[PDB]
Amino acid sequence: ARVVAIISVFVILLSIVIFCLETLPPFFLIETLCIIWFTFELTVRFDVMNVIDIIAIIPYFITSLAILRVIRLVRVFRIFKLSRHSKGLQILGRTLKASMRELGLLIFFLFIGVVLFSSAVYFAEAGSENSFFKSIPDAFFWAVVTMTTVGYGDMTPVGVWGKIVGSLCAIAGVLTIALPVPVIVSNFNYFYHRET
Amino acid sequence: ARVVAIISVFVILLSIVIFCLETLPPFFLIETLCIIWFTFELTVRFDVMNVIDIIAIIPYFITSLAILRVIRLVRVFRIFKLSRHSKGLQILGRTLKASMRELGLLIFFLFIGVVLFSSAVYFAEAGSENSFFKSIPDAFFWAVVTMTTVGYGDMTPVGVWGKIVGSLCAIAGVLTIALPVPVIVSNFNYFYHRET
Amino acid sequence: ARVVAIISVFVILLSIVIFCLETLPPFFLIETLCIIWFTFELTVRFDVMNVIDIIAIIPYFITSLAILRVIRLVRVFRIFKLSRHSKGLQILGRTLKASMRELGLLIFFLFIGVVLFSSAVYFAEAGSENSFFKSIPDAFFWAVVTMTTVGYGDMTPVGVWGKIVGSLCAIAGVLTIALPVPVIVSNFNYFYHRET
Amino acid sequence: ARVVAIISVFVILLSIVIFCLETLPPFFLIETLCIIWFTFELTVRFDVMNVIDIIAIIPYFITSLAILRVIRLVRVFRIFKLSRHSKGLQILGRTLKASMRELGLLIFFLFIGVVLFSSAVYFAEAGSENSFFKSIPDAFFWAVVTMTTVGYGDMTPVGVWGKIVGSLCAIAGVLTIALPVPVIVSNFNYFYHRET
Ligand SMILES: [K+]
Ligand SMILES: [K+]
């Protein structure tokens, strides 16, 4: 039995690897052995894990560009089959389930901040011929990268008033992201300690 | 009554949406129904929330480019009418009110650091023909993005002494921003726990 | 007496302001009134604060490009005269004095990491004609910005092995900077609580 | 004896310095005195420290480009001989040994996130002629810098769907890196307190 679990993990990892390398600038035969093994255990077994196992097989049987792209993307959920053997991924899923309200609050704060600062910078830079934001929707990406401190890149065209708005945006984003993270971190620490 | 609150939230969200999309590269009719509903509840109702409700209607009645731009910008405070229904935004406002001194201290530390490091980098790079900072005021944005770890972008023209100053600036900014944030975070956690 | 303290703070702020604006692409007369007031209180008064007061007057009396640049730079210590009236700056100075060993440890860890990763990336990218680091000393700035998460900017010329080294550098820098900061933060919180 | 330890630290630092400066765009004679002193103490002494001492001498005696590059790189472990005299480096090594599982969990979470978001952005941007990611492997560096908040640089070619994926990537990376760091930080604080 322990040898089979090693075999199953090896097959899952091989499927993940071949899934990545088939996109590089045979594969189907190896994938076929993976899909037979995937469905072979499914019938013997026959929860979220079972649903993921179903999704891991649907794109194979099915095979309008949007539909094909969607099914090709949904094929990536092979990597989530590792949750059966891995423990950290199970812990991460449990914490994500148990911290839904804080995630919603974080998204709401980010949304309020992004619309506020996008309007502010758009109006502050609307009085110049060369505008770095065509519209309020065009500035959501800039605001979300600045508030996350990932960094937009170049702020050269931005004028003096725009620079003041951007400095305020940086400080406010630092604060508003430092706000709702510790609760999620504490939940993860709780679950990890309980598991270990 | 519960249906009306759903209607009110729907109207607020519709106003926010149409406010963003009217800036994209009819709308007035929908906005008119919003402004009638906004003033209709105001008279029936007749605090910070009431003041915000007044500001949400002033730009409509009023309608020198600076004055027009200012009123168009102050029109964005429709989004703060969500504080009546939302709870997280109320919590954020309460924490911002209750942590004024720490915000002032953070701004003071940032101001001292920005002027100090701006003078340092300006003087260190004043001995070269190609200067990356024309004046001490010209370096406030660079210092504030470096100390926030958002990132300025390109430091190539910066010379060896300028690079040493910038490394010191990065380390010092990391420290001086990690200093005053935990108190604000703890205040927010306190208010959020009390509300829930 | 309270009016004089307001006057003294006003004079210090005016000196700081005029010091910044004289560098923009009269001033001496206003500065002369500042320097007379600075020396007038010094004689009446006659610690670190007293030493700073001495340094605030030395460049005036003194007035080989390096010496002139050094004295012009050391003139900026007018801003530290605010420590007499401000309390947060005193707290920051006390914490900096009381956390010397941790600052030294942080600098040592940064030094070990920067030399290690600079050698690693230099050797990994030495097998290509187009090298993004001429020498091990040339990579200290890249390593210090990557480990601080400020960001170097463009990593395009960096090859596959260089990219692996850079990913390791990012992760290791995140860890090694998250390591020694909480002690300094706790010291600052202690001093701020004691003062308030 | 205390003078010899000063001499030994001076020799180690001199070796580290000359090792860096020999790469700049005599040295062997000084290095020879270092290698004689390194082997002289080794015989008198004759653990991880002893192994490091052996590695510090192997490249000298040995002296196919890959082998030469590998030995030249492995010569850099002179800097780890400072662990005998320094205490912070010993503490860092002890914490790294005592926090292996959390490092593995962090690498696993980063791996899952990087493959997931690389597939997501690659599929979202596969419907345009100008693609910012040739393949799923080509996006690991972008995902790892975005999730670490170091910053990739320019996101201009990235389209609307790609921008939504990138915003999700930034938020998720912030969370998933804030998750497993506090345990390592607490371990380091424990070891540092015990040592002091
Ligand atoms: K950054
Ligand atoms: K950052």
Helices (H) and strands (E) counted in chain D, each on its own, are: 10, 0
Chain center to CA of C177: 17
CATH code for the domain in which residue B133 is found: 1.10.287.70
Tokens representing residue B38 in the block: 């906004």
DSSP line for D165-193? HHHHHHHHHHHHHHTTHHHHHHHHHHHHH
Task: Confirm whether B193 is domain-assigned.
Answer: no
- Cβ pair C146, C171 in contact under 8 A: no
For residue D170, report the distance from its CA to the centre of ligand 1, in Å: 11
At which residue do the structure tokens 């990356």 appear?
Answer: B132
Q: Which of residues 132-161 of C touch D (CB under 8 A)?
A: 134-137, 146, 149-151, 153-155
Task: Confirm whether C185 is domain-assigned.
Answer: no
Closest-CA distance, C192 to chain D, in angstroms, reads 22
At which residue do the structure tokens 């600045």 appear?
Answer: A146
| Dist. CA D88–CA D157, nearest whole Å | 45
Task: Confirm whether C141 is domain-assigned.
Answer: yes
Chain center to CA of A31: 25
**Do D112 and D165 belong to one domain?**
yes
- The span from the first CA to the last CA of chain A, in angstroms, equals 24
Q: Report DSSP state, residue B156.
A: T
> Do D141 and C166 lie within an 8 Å CB cutoff?
yes
3-state SS string over chain C?
A: CHHHHHHHHHHHHHHHHHHHHCCCCCHHHHHHHHHHHHHHHHHHHCCHHHHHHHHCCHHHHHCCHHHHHHHHHHHHHHHHHHHHCCCHHHHHHHHHHHCHHHHHHHHHHHHHHHHHHHHHHHHHCCCCCCCCCCCCHHHHHHHHHHHHCCCCCCCCCCCHHHHHHHHHHHHHHHHHHHCCHHHHHHHHHHHHHHHC
| Dist. CA D37–CA D14, nearest whole Å | 12
Inter-chain Cβ pairs, chain A and chain D, closer than 8 A: 83
Interface mutation target, options C15, C24, C109, C150, chain B, most CBs of B under 10 Å: C150
By the CB < 8 Å criterion, does A115 face chain B?
yes
Task: Confirm whether D171 is domain-assigned.
Answer: yes
CA distances from B28 to A29, B15, B31, B78, C61 (A): 61, 11, 5, 16, 68
Cross-chain CB nearest to C119 (options D73, D106, D189): D73
Task: Confirm whether C92 is domain-assigned.
Answer: no
**Do B71 and B127 belong to one domain?**
no
Interface mutation target, options D150, D152, D190, chain C, most CBs of C under 10 Å: D150
By the CB < 8 Å criterion, does C187 face chain D?
no
> How many C-beta atoms lie closer than 10 Å to residue D139's C-beta?
23
> Do C137 and D24 lie within an 8 Å CB cutoff?
yes
Q: Pick the last residue of a domain from C34, C52, C86.
A: C86
By the CB < 8 Å criterion, does D99 face chain A?
no
- Cβ pair A39, A56 in contact under 8 A: no
List Cβ neighbours of D132 (8 Å cut-off, separation of 6 or more).
Answer: D121, D125, D157, D158, D162
Question: Which positions in chain C touch D190 (Cβ < 8 Å)?
Answer: none
By the CB < 8 Å criterion, does C18 face chain D?
no
Tokens representing residue C61 in the block: 């009396």
| Dist. CA C137–CA C130, nearest whole Å | 17
**Do A133 and A61 belong to one domain?**
no
Cross-chain CB nearest to B188 (options A122, A150, A179): A179
Tell me how many degrees the CA angle A59-A61-A63 measures, rounded to the nearest 5. Answer: 70
CATH code for the domain in which residue C65 is found: 1.20.120.350
For residue D173, report the distance from its CA to the centre of ligand 1, in Å: 13
Structure determined by: cryo-EM
For residue D180, report the distance from its CA to the centre of ligand 2, in Å: 18
> Do C171 and D150 lie within an 8 Å CB cutoff?
no
Tokens representing residue B170 in the block: 């990065």
What resolution, expressed in A, was reported for this entry?
2.9
Tokens representing residue A86 in the block: 């891995």
Inter-chain Cβ pairs, chain B and chain C, closer than 8 A: 83
Q: Which domain holds residue B67?
A: 2-86
| Dist. CA C146–CA D196, nearest whole Å | 30
> How many domains is chain C built from?
2
- Cβ pair B167, B121 in contact under 8 A: no
Task: Confirm whether A164 is domain-assigned.
Answer: yes
List Cβ neighbours of B186 (8 Å cut-off, separation of 6 or more).
Answer: none
**Do A69 and A21 belong to one domain?**
yes
- Cβ pair A136, B78 in contact under 8 A: no
| Dist. CA B113–CA B29, nearest whole Å | 51
